[PDB]
């Protein structure tokens, strides 16, 4: 599986297409993002270093 | 004796490692081939255009040579 997951990165992440499109869409990281409460990802994905796992 | 599920270690699969690595082209090397193909490209193309001139004058000569037409 270790090689299989990194095959997606060589296909999607390094490409110009994703770095042109998905970059700068719905940038929400402020106290307002905390005022919506997404819990998993979003806040975890960007900003606050918080998780229930730890 | 009671038998259940057994554990296996050996190498532990090796989790989280960058498999992505740069191959073939480096940067400066591909530009030498790129401009090199261009320099070979224009030089070989214009030689046929000079060879076309041998035909070009000779083809239009047929109209000048033929006046009973």
Swiss-Prot record, chain A:
As for subcellular location, the record says: Mitochondrion inner membrane
Please indicate which superkingdom the organism of origin belongs to.
Answer: Eukaryota
Which family does the record assign?
Answer: Belongs to the complex I 49 kDa subunit family.
Q: What does this protein do?
A: Core subunit of the mitochondrial membrane respiratory chain NADH dehydrogenase (Complex I) which catalyzes electron transfer from NADH through the respiratory chain, using ubiquinone as an electron acceptor. Essential for the catalytic activity and assembly of complex I. Redox-sensitive, critical component of the oxygen-sensing pathway in the pulmonary vasculature which plays a key role in acute pulmonary oxygen-sensing and hypoxic pulmonary vasoconstriction. Plays an important role in carotid body sensing of hypoxia.
- Quaternary organization: Core subunit of respiratory chain NADH dehydrogenase (Complex I) which is composed of 45 different subunits. Component of the iron-sulfur (IP) fragment of the enzyme. Interacts with NDUFAF3. Interacts with NDUFAF7. Interacts with CERS2.
Name assigned to this protein: NADH dehydrogenase [ubiquinone] iron-sulfur protein 2, mitochondrial
Q: Which gene encodes it?
A: NDUFS2
Q: Which residues of the full protein are shown?
A: 251 to 304 of 463
Curated annotation (Swiss-Prot), chain B:
> What does the UniProt entry say about where the protein is found?
Mitochondrion inner membrane; Nucleus
Query: Tell me, what does this protein do in biology?
Result: Accessory subunit of the mitochondrial membrane respiratory chain NADH dehydrogenase (Complex I), that is believed not to be involved in catalysis. Complex I functions in the transfer of electrons from NADH to the respiratory chain. The immediate electron acceptor for the enzyme is believed to be ubiquinone. Involved in the interferon/all-trans-retinoic acid (IFN/RA) induced cell death. This apoptotic activity is inhibited by interaction with viral IRF1. Prevents the transactivation of STAT3 target genes.
Q: Any S-S bridges, and between which cysteines?
A: none
- The shown residues of the full protein are 32 to 74 of 144
Q: List where the protein spans the membrane.
A: 27-46
Q: Which family does it belong to?
A: Belongs to the complex I NDUFA13 subunit family.
Per its record, how is this protein called by name?
NADH dehydrogenase [ubiquinone] 1 alpha subcomplex subunit 13
Q: Which domain of life is it from?
A: Eukaryota
Q: How does it assemble?
A: Complex I is composed of 45 different subunits. Interacts with CARD15, but not with CARD4. Interacts with STAT3, but not with STAT1, STAT2 and STAT5A. Interacts with OLFM4.
Tell me the organism: Bos taurus
């Amino acid at each position: 599986f270790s090689l299989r997951i990194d095959e997606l990165e060589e296909m999607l992440t390094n490409n110009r297409i994703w770095r042109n499109r998905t970059v700068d869409i719905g940038i929400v990281t402020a106290e307002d993002a905390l005022n919506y409460g997404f819990s998993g990802v979003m806040l975890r994905g960007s900003g606050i270093q918080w998780d229930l796992r730890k | 004796x009671x038998x259940x599920x057994x554990x296996x270690x050996x190498x532990x699969x090796x989790x989280x490692x960058x498999x992505x690595x740069x191959x073939x082209x480096x940067g400066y090397s591909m530009f030498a081939v790129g401009i090199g193909a261009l320099l070979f490209g224009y030089w070989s193309m214009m030689k046929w255009n000079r060879e076309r001139r041998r035909l070009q004058i000779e083809d239009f000569e047929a109209r000048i040579a033929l006046m009973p037409l």
